[PDB]
Amino acid sequence: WFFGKIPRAKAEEMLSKQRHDGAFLIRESESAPGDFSLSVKFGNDVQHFKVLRDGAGKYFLWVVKFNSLNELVDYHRSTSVSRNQQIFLRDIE
Amino acid sequence: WFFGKIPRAKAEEMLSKQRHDGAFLIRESESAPGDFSLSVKFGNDVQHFKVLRDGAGKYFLWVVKFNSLNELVDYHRSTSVSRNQQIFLRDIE
């Protein structure tokens, strides 16, 4: 799935002819040095997602973080508070 | 659900008597200044999760990040690459 530094338009060309939603490639972005981009076919067009990096060197596309404790709590009523177990928050009685 | 700076043991005391898995409170940690802890009843005991913060001031409990592009790609075969749409990666044919 890794296509090196192929032009963005060529990635769109290849993916547009793909039959299945989700057909994808990783390419090296012509924008900023050292960047990676994920191009994916979805429906009638091709979408591009920047591969992000953090200070530790890790990769990610998107992460969920919260502007308030209240939003963290409400989010974890339906997503587990633990990576290793399914634990969902319920109000104290 | 916010109980201020109540002792950890008192949080365990209250939550242990709760009937439902997921009963919870947020308290201010007696460990490091300005810290928050989430205490949750689950099964026979009470688990404690540090509320983490990032440089932007946001809160989170856990985030998913990757040590390699290969792990990012494989993870997003089953979790959407987009926060706003359900897009899952499929190999090119």
Side-chain angles (χ1 to χ4, degrees):
Chain A
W1 37 252
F2 184 89
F3 284 73
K5 200 175 190 143
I6 57 155
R8 180 160 312 212
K10 189 181 191 181
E12 297 174 352
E13 191 191 291
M14 298 182 177
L15 294 177
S16 64
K17 313 193 214 301
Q18 284 291 305
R19 298 174 173 173
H20 304 295
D21 284 348
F24 77 96
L25 58 88
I26 294 286
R27 60 186 166 85
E28 308 194 75
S29 169
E30 330 190 80
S31 62
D35 272 359
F36 297 104
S37 284
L38 167 69
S39 303
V40 184
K41 184 199 175 263
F42 195 69
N44 305 315
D45 59 335
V46 174
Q47 293 184 35
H48 304 282
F49 305 87
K50 190 171 315 210
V51 183
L52 306 172
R53 276 194 187 263
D54 73 15
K58 312 278 219 203
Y59 305 96
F60 61 101
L61 298 183
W62 57 279
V63 296
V64 182
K65 290 174 179 183
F66 308 103
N67 294 329
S68 64
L69 294 177
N70 200 339
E71 284 163 288
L72 182 155
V73 161
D74 288 342
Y75 175 91
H76 283 289
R77 294 179 188 279
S78 53
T79 299
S80 180
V81 300
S82 172
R83 185 196 308 261
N84 310 129
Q85 299 184 276
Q86 296 313 289
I87 304 174
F88 308 104
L89 298 183
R90 287 186 63 173
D91 292 278
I92 288 183
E93 302 163 305
Chain B
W1 37 252
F2 184 89
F3 284 73
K5 200 175 190 143
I6 57 155
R8 180 160 312 212
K10 189 181 191 181
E12 297 174 352
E13 191 191 291
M14 298 182 177
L15 294 177
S16 64
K17 313 193 214 301
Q18 284 291 305
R19 298 174 173 173
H20 304 295
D21 284 348
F24 77 96
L25 58 88
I26 294 286
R27 60 186 166 85
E28 308 194 75
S29 169
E30 330 190 80
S31 62
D35 272 359
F36 297 104
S37 284
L38 167 69
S39 303
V40 184
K41 184 199 175 263
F42 195 69
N44 305 315
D45 59 335
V46 174
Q47 293 184 35
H48 304 282
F49 305 87
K50 190 171 315 210
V51 183
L52 306 172
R53 276 194 187 263
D54 73 15
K58 313 278 219 203
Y59 305 96
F60 61 101
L61 298 183
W62 57 279
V63 296
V64 182
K65 290 174 179 183
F66 308 103
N67 294 329
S68 64
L69 294 177
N70 200 339
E71 284 163 288
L72 182 155
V73 161
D74 288 342
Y75 175 91
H76 283 289
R77 294 179 188 279
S78 53
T79 299
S80 180
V81 300
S82 172
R83 185 196 308 261
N84 310 129
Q85 299 184 276
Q86 296 313 289
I87 304 174
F88 308 104
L89 298 183
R90 287 186 63 173
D91 292 278
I92 288 183
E93 302 163 305

